[PDB]
């Protein structure tokens, strides 16, 4: 009944998981096996968040009480240790609201009590626990969780876990830990209760979190915020957190994402040992011999691959003043009536000036996009151009199709393809032309497919024929220029180049306006050379092509160089940095030091090698650091070169070799 | 013909933004384009920005200015577009449901419908 919560708001803390978090995959059980599994596990020395809730008595101290919301994500991993119980549940859901049906959690001295309603959360949920008036004893006034439920829809109950009721002792040692996942529509519960000798952080033991329950709700989760119980402000200090206090508390909280773990199963079939594989590279080398225990030597692990950092497409020149585009902007053309029909393999006319940073809608593509032109382009296609008044195209426009304006220049039913319509004073080359041409607007006899009216047909037809190239509605079939009154006309005039779709023997003819990227060399980027396509490390080439030659092949029948469509500069394609990842490593027993060495690989190229990504002061350490060495096997990390030239004791190539030394 | 789900639309306002979307015909499927021309008598109407099957290039603006458009959504799929300042003023109709024509392109002079049909008579113009 709070309209926000009030308290000190101090920002949060961190602290280190260690090894905390480990649940059993699965009810199978395993006596003496290393079983790996893929599942939501925490990651292994990760940082989860310390909420802190305490009181000091004195003139002045650190006190707060801290149960915001907080996103569920794929899972939620929760801890606590307090000498008294004060976390008394959670609540789980996506709006904490009565809109959506939303899971709670909640504990009191008799049993554990789980409901399913469309419960109004508070603003700042908690338990409301007073002294009694002649018992002493902690006693429940309110239930400031939610206002109301107005539905329900299952309800279930539970022994009691550890109780603590009044604290006592100067140790935390009541230690629960809590992990909640909501997968397959299973609101999966592990938790586990073990004793502690600490007064602040974590231990350092470990120890598997057994399952408890499993509740298929199947309501998706989305939020999630812890609550407690607070008592009454006037009776006992401390911060006022919407006007009531608690005593002193501590809690932590993490997240689950998706790897893979090496589970250690007891005789017994209790889990003792875990190693998280995406911990250091010992722990990858240990998952992949499965075993946690490495003897001395240099094994392949993992594949290391520089995936391509953008993608680079491009084509024949511009063109900026072609002469086949010439004939398009202001040379041998005319209307529809008398367009210019065209098809080469020589370049591309001025319209795709504007295809480079200022593709405007003048590029009218119907049912296609013109990024599609350079994946694959069409079938044969002509090239008619001619002068109009901007958007008079539609008539001729791909999708008018099927005798609805096909009278003053038929095309075919199918026709789904491009359409260009530029004009600009900057990004282009010439100004649009006249447009005062000849129209026809409509006719009797039908028209040939994909070609314009050449008959001189009269219709006599009509009383008061329109006057100008503007005006009322026209009858008139014949006259100088022609709109339609039944659509918008009169727009700027523009020349609009159609590709005129024929659907016949040659493909893959003259095409639309086709992108020309930025040129990329020495930088993996995936290229896209007139329809020859491929990923690679673009540079500099000293072949000499002949002119009619475009890109070149080597013995193996594979690309390994263009010819640049625009510079006319060969560019040697070199195939992306990858290689082998063997981890270098003495006897597990002897030392936990490792070195990465990564095959045919040059040592600049390591970091961005699809690592940074990983935990950095684990795995970082060995992607880079001062003692980067590069021999001819590979690139060799996390070791020393020396010039004294011991004997071999771990084989790397080319007549090196790595061994341990205090 | 059936109203399809929608999350906002209408006559647009002065000020800030809306996020007009309309059901689409597929489900889980964003490889769609859309439509928002409106149709009436008069020359009170004004340009819509269309989006490409292929989703790459954004709006008549281009991509290089434009802002992604969400297309996907797992309760029922959606199309999710942002408005540009625009004059309030405005007499067209709207209609939420099966658009006439899913041959999307990059087209200007296509429109959604060349008549008009069934649809709210909300008008601010006259």
């Known amino acids: 009944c709070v309209n926000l919560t009030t308290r000190t708001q101090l920002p949060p803390a961190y602290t280190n998981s260690f090894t905390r978090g480990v649940y059993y995959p699965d009810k199978v059980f395993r006596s003496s096996v290393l079983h790996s599994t893929q599942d939501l596990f925490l990651p292994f020395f990760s940082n989860v968040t310390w909420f802190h809730a305490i009181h000091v008595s004195g003139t002045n101290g650190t006190k707060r009480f801290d149960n915001p919301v907080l996103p569920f994500n794929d899972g939620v991993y929760f801890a606590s240790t307090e000498k008294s119980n004060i976390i008394r549940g959670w609540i789980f859901g996506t709006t904490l609201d009565s809109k959506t049906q939303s899971l709670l959690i909640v504990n009191n001295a008799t049993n554990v009590v789980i409901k399913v309603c469309e419960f109004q959360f508070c603003n700042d949920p908690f338990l409301g626990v007073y002294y009694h008036k002649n018992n002493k004893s902690w006693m429940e006034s309110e239930f400031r969780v939610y206002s109301s439920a107005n539905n329900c829809t299952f309800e279930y109950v539970s022994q009691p876990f550890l109780m603590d009721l009044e604290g006592k002792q100067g140790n935390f040692k009541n230690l629960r830990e809590f992990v909640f996942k909501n997968i397959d529509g299973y609101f999966k519960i592990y938790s586990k209760h073990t004793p502690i000798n600490l007064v602040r952080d974590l231990p350092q033991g470990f120890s598997a979190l057994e399952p408890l329950v499993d509740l298929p709700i199947g309501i998706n989760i989305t939020r999630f915020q812890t609550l407690l119980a607070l008592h009454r402000s006037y009776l006992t200090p401390g911060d006022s957190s919407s006007g009531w206090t608690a005593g002193a508390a501590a809690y932590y909280v993490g997240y689950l994402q998706p790897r893979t773990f090496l589970l250690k199963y007891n005789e017994n079939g209790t889990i003792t040992d875990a190693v998280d594989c995406a911990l250091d590279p010992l722990s990858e080398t240990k998952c992949t011999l499965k075993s946690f225990t490495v003897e001395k030597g240099i094994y392949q692990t993992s594949n290391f691959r520089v995936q391509p950092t953008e993608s680079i497409v491009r084509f024949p020149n511009i063109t900026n003043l072609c002469p086949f585009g010439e004939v398009f902007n202001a040379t041998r053309f005319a209307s529809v009536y008398a367009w210019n029909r065209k098809r080469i393999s020589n370049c591309v006319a001025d319209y795709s000036v504007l295809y480079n940073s200022a593709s405007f809608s003048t590029f009218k593509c119907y049912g296609v996009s013109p990024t599609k032109l350079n994946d694959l382009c069409f079938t044969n296609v002509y090239a008619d151009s001619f002068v109009i008044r901007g958007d008079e195209v539609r008539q001729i426009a791909p999708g008018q199709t099927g005798k609805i304006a096909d009278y003053n220049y038929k095309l075919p039913d199918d026709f789904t393809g491009c359409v260009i319509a530029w004009n600009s004073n900057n990004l282009d080359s010439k100004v649009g032309g006249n447009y005062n041409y000849l129209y026809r607007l409509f006719r009797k006899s039908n028209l040939k497919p994909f070609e314009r009216d050449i008959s001189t047909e009269i219709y006599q037809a009509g009383s008061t024929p329109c006057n100008g190239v503007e005006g009322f509605n026209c009858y008139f079939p014949l006259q100088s220029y022609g709109f339609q009154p039944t659509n918008g006309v009169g727009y700027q005039p523009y020349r609009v180049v159609v590709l005129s779709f024929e659907l016949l023997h040659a493909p893959a003819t003259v095409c639309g306006p086709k992108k020309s990227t930025n040129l990329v060399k020495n930088k993996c980027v995936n290229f896209n050379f007139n329809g020859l396509t491929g990923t690679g490390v673009l540079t500099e080439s000293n072949k000499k092509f002949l002119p009619f030659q475009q890109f070149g092949r080597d013995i193996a029948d594979t690309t390994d160089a263009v010819r640049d469509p625009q510079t006319l500069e060969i560019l040697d394609i070199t195939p992306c940095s990858f290689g082998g990842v063997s981890v270098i490593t003495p006897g597990t027993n002897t030392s936990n030091q490792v070195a990465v060495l990564y095959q045919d690989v040059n040592c600049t190229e390591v970091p961005v090698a699809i690592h940074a990504d990983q935990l950095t002061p684990t795995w970082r350490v060995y992607s880079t650091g001062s003692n980067v060495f590069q021999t001819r096997a590979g690139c060799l990390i996390g070791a020393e070169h020396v010039n004294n030239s011991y004997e071999c004791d771990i084989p790397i190539g080319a007549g090196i070799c790595a061994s341990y030394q205090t | 013909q059936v109203q399809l789900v929608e999350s906002g639309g209408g006559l647009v306002q002065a000020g800030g933004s809306l996020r007009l979307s309309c059901a689409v015909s597929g489900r889980t499927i964003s490889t769609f384009g859309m439509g928002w021309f409106r149709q009436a008598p008069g020359k009170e109407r004004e340009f819509v920005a269309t989006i490409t099957r292929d989703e790459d290039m954004l709006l008549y603006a281009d991509s290089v200015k434009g802002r992604f458009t969400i297309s996907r959504d797992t309760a029922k799929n959606m199309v999710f577009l942002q408005m540009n300042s625009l004059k309030i003023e405005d007499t067209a109709l709207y209609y939420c449901?099966?658009?006439?024509?899913?041959?999307?392109?990059?087209?200007?002079?296509?429109?959604?419908?060349?008549?008009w049909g069934q649809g709210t008579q909300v008008t601010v113009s006259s």
């Open positions: 449901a099966v658009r006439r024509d899913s041959s999307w392109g990059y087209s200007r002079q296509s429109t959604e419908y060349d008549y």
